[PDB]
Amino acid sequence: YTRVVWCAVGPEEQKKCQQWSQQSGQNVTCATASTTDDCIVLVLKGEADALNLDGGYIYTAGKCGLVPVLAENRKSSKHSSLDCVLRPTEGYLAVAVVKKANEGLTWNSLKDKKSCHTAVDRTAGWNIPMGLIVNQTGSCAFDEFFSQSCAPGADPKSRLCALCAGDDQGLDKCVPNSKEKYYGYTGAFRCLAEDVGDVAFVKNDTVWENTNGESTADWAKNLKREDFRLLCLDGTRKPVTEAQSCHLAVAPNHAVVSRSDRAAHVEQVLLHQQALFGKNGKNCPDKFCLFKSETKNLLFNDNTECLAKLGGRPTYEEYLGTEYVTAIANLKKCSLEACAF
Ligand SMILES: *[C@@H]1O[C@H](CO)[C@@H](O[C@@H]2O[C@H](CO)[C@@H](O[C@@H]3O[C@H](CO)[C@@H](O)[C@H](O)[C@@H]3O)[C@H](O)[C@H]2NC(C)=O)[C@H](O)[C@H]1NC(C)=O
Ligand SMILES: CC(C)NC[C@@H](O)COc1ccc(CC(N)=O)cc1
Ligand SMILES: *[C@@H]1O[C@H](CO)[C@@H](O)[C@H](O)[C@H]1NC(C)=O
Ligand SMILES: [Fe+3]
Ligand SMILES: [Zn+2]
Ligand SMILES: [Zn+2]
């Protein structure tokens, strides 16, 4: 009965979640929805207890009263001593990526180009880039900036969805879940890698994990780090090893959210679950690995070492940071006291 109902987004996260449930002796059970927003609603209704969310969704969930519980903690070895779970999270680097061979393409020449986004409302693939575009362009017409784009979650008949491919059967075009071929970090990077788009708004870690043999996936096997360039905000182009000096912003780590009244219980269960299926987990990579899904980032990002405790008992605004929270407000004025359901 001290069971947590996780919310899976899409049928792939659903399959993984059921695997995790089977392996957990049903201490973790699953609910599934077609979109992250839908999953947030199941949580709000009390039909689900939690899910891991990108910062852009943390904001949406936050206005509706959901709270940050644990955050993804990546592999970084500085802040050396502390165990991952107590280690402060460092946020990730949102970057704008292009093909090297696409010479001359700079932040300054993006208008009317083809773009690849993780999804609408996500931090690196949308809020940061479009916030900057809107900032600099003076206009709220961010649907008219790129000639065509794949921005999962936008209107399927609009140009913002024109580049999306849907699933293997061409169905679910532009849906904001993994069925969409160009969804999320990897999908958006694939959109760029296959030259469907001119630029991809992902994070620094995405380019590395999908190049120089790190993938084995058909589309990425032959990808070489040198064939890509990051677009700095000053107009220059740098190699992807220069992310620390050429990025659009550092994003708050994806984090697990739940209803305030269920947070403590979710925190508790989760810590026990990762001890079992986490990075050094008791049953991983033997029975089941929570943070692994063949580089598809299902439920959690695949580069997650562990889920770490937060700190000054973070409200959702403190977790995202004032800088980021203001940015989203300024961007969504284009579409404070809110929620949306
Ligand atoms: C797009 O819209 C505006 C363009 O200026 C940006 O919003 C502004 O962001 C600044 C920087 O974070 C905010 O300044 C802050 O002010 C408080 C006190 O007012 C201060 O304590 C902080 O240290 C900081 O200086 C400013 O409030 C905010 N402007 C408005 C009208 O809300 C926004 O960041 C731009 N979007 C992106 C993604 O850059
Ligand atoms: C307003 C007062 C001072 N509270 C600040 C507070 O609760 C801040 O929250 C946080 C959240 C997350 C992080 C990142 C980190 N490295 O721990 C740092 C600080
Ligand atoms: C389920 O959770 C309980 C409560 O903490 C724990 O004692 C038990 O080991 C877990 N069962 C399985 C099969 O993991
Ligand atoms: Fe993200
Ligand atoms: Zn920076
Ligand atoms: Zn606080």
3-state secondary structure the chain: CCCEEEEEEHHHHHHHHHHHHHHHCCCEEEEEECCHHHHHHHHHHCCCCEEEECHHHHHHHHHCCEEEEEEEEECCCCCCCCCCCCCCCCCEEEEEEEECCCCCCCHHHCCCCEEEECCCCCHHHHHHHHHHHHHHHCCCCCCCCCCEEECCCCCCCCCCCCCCCCCCCCCCCCCCCCCCCCCHHHHHHHHHHCCCCCEEEEEHHHHHHCCCCCCCCHHHHCCCHHHEEEECCCCCEEEHHHHHHCCCEEECCCEEEEEHHHHHHHHHHHHHHHHHHCCCCCCCCCCCCCCCCCCCCCCCCCCEEEEEECCCCCCHHHHHCHHHHHHHHHHCCCCCCCCCC
CATH of 74-254+317-327, one of 2.30.110.10, 3.30.300.30, 4.10.320.10, 3.40.190.10: 3.40.190.10
What is the spatial distance between Cα 15 and Cα 22, in angstroms, rounded to a whole number? 11
Judge if the beta carbon of residue 24 lies within 6 A of ligand 3. yes
Judge residue 208's burial from the number of C-beta atoms within 10 Å of its C-beta, 0-12 exposed, 13-18 middle, 19 or more buried.
middle
* Residue type at position 191: C
Could you tell me which of 263, 283, 220, 304 has the C-alpha nearest to residue 50? 263
Ligand 3, atom 2, residue with closest C-alpha: 27
Asked if residues 50 and 4 have their Cβ atoms less than 8 Å apart, the reply is yes
Count, residues in the chain: 341
Could you tell me which of 18, 73, 75, 48 has the C-alpha nearest to residue 257? 48
What is the spatial distance between Cα 139 and Cα 232, in angstroms, rounded to a whole number? 22
Domain range summary for the chain, segments of one domain joined by +: 2-73+255-316, 74-254+317-327
**Cα torsion angle, 312, 313, 317, 321, sign:** positive
Q: How far is the CA of 15 from the centre of ligand 4 (A)?
A: 22
What is the spatial distance between Cα 122 and Cα 182, in angstroms, rounded to a whole number? 14
Residues in the ligand 2 pocket, defined by CB under 6 Å: 88-89, 311-312, 314, 318-319
Could you tell me which of 51, 75, 57, 89 has the C-alpha nearest to residue 299? 51
Q: Is 131 annotated as a binding residue?
A: no
First and final CA of the chain: distance in angstroms?
A: 28
Domains 2-73+255-316 and 74-254+317-327 share a fold: yes
Q: How far is the CA of 27 from the centre of ligand 3 (A)?
A: 6
Q: Are strands 228-231 and 92-99 parallel, antiparallel or unpaired?
A: antiparallel
Residue that the structure tokens 């997650």 belong to: 304
Method: X-ray
Q: Are strands 249-251 and 4-9 parallel, antiparallel or unpaired?
A: unpaired
What number does the ligand 1 atom closest to the CA of 135 have?
1
Asked if residues 39 and 64 have their Cβ atoms less than 8 Å apart, the reply is no
Measured between alpha carbons, how far is residue 303 from residues 76, 114, 182, 300 in Å? 10, 28, 19, 8
Q: Is 33 annotated as a binding residue?
A: no
Q: How far is the CA of 241 from the centre of ligand 4 (A)?
A: 20
What number does the ligand 3 atom closest to the CA of 269 have?
5
Show me where the chain is broken: residue before each gap, C-N > 2.5 A. Answer: 335
Judge if the beta carbon of residue 211 lies within 6 A of ligand 3. no
219: left (phi over 0), alpha (psi -120 to 50) or beta: alpha
Residue that the structure tokens 């071929």 belong to: 181
Could you tell me which of 233, 261, 297 has the C-alpha nearest to residue 36? 297
Q: How far is the CA of 48 from the centre of ligand 1 (A)?
A: 35
Q: How far is the CA of 43 from the centre of ligand 3 (A)?
A: 23
What is the spatial distance between Cα 301 and Cα 295, in angstroms, rounded to a whole number? 8
Q: Is 124 annotated as a binding residue?
A: yes
* Residue type at position 278: G
Asked if residues 3 and 26 have their Cβ atoms less than 8 Å apart, the reply is yes
Could you tell me which of 50, 116, 78 has the C-alpha nearest to residue 259? 50
Q: What's the CATH code, domain 2-73+255-316? A: 3.40.190.10
Q: Are strands 249-251 and 92-99 parallel, antiparallel or unpaired?
A: antiparallel
276: left (phi over 0), alpha (psi -120 to 50) or beta: alpha
